[PDB]
Scaffold this active site. Structure first.
Site: not given
Ligand SMILES: [Cl-]
Ligand SMILES: [Cl-]
Length: 162
Positions: A104, A11, A32, A132, A117, A20
């Site tokens: 996250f 990040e 965010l 996948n 998955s 972002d």
């Protein structure tokens, strides 16, 4: 390497409101602020989040504080989620970090959506799960970061981050 260092790598850290990869107002270590297009709406959420008038800028400690809250909330969200919890309990420590990273970034709801998955991870079919996981908007939109997470799930080591 641990979850904190992994997410700090994925990040980055910015001390001024920024946009972002999706174009939303963010600050610190991937926190965010709002999906709204208004920069005022962003500053308002920021001030509410920090408890002072920031004028769009925070210190390193403040960024770190938000980040500690966020990883905590991610973990707790996984544990309260009926679809996620069982996957998490089944995994080793490194792979748990990979699932936390996805949550996250994309929210519990989003991850819970990778039904197939998740089932493959639970069954420990590593290579199949990796294949996948790549068939997703997530991978197409942020391929370098997705590749790192995927490699972590496939191998169970921190190699992609080293
Ligand atoms: Cl907050
Ligand atoms: Cl990327």
């Amino acid at each position: 390497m641990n979850i904190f260092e992994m997410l700090r790598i994925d990040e980055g850290l910015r001390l001024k409101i920024y946009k972002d990869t999706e174009g939303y107002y963010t600050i610190g270590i991937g926190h965010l602020l709002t999906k709204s297009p208004s920069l005022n709406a962003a500053k308002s959420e920021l001030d509410k989040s920090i408890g002072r008038n920031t004028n769009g800028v925070i210190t390193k400690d403040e960024a770190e504080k938000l980040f500690n809250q966020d990883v905590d909330a991610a973990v707790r969200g996984i544990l309260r989620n009926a679809k996620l919890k069982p996957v998490y309990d089944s995994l080793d420590a490194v792979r748990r970090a990979a699932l936390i990273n996805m949550v996250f970034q994309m929210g519990e709801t989003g991850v819970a959506g990778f039904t197939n998955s998740l089932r493959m991870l639970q069954q420990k079919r590593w290579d199949e799960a990796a294949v996948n996981l790549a068939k997703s908007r997530w991978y197409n939109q942020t391929p370098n970061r997705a590749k790192r997470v995927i490699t972590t799930f496939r191998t169970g080591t921190w190699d992609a981050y080293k």
